[PDB]
Amino acid sequence: GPLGSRANPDPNCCLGVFGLSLYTTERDLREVFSKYGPIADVSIVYDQQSRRSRGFAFVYFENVDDAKEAKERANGMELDGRRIRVDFSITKRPHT
Numbered sequence: 001g002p003l004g005s006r007a008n009p010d011p012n013c014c015l016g017v018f019g020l021s022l023y024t025t026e027r028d029l030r031e032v033f034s035k036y037g038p039i040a041d042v043s044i045v046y047d048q049q050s051r052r053s054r055g056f057a058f059v060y061f062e063n064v065d066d067a068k069e070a071k072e073r074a075n076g077m078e079l080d081g082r083r084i085r086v087d088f089s090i091t092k093r094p095h096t
Contacts, residue, residue, distance in 0.1 A: 006087070008089065013064045014091065015087065017029065017074075017084060017085075018055070018084065018086075019084045024057070032077075032079055033059045033070055033074065036061075037061055037062065037063065037070070038063070039062070040061065043057060045057060058089060071088060074086045
């Protein structure tokens with residue numbers, strides 16, 4: 001149902017996208033998200049034993065301002081009959 005408590009209030013060119021369909025593709029995500037500016041890539045998350053989608057993905061813009069427009073426009077809309085959610089994200093690297 002409804003949810004207000006989940007958010008990432010820190011802008012970046014990387015967005016995480018959640019609540020997708022098992023039939024959603026990186027083409028359909030490009031078709032939803034390229035409305036807001038240039039895209040570097042898009043990657044869906046898949047299960048490592050059953051090889052199906054896990055219902056979430058990450059979208060990578062060329063600039064933080066394109067990702068800001070996208071996060072204000074796509075967050076909470078409908079795609080393939082499934083009602084999504086969209087938030088800012090960041091990359092990671094090992095360190096010692």
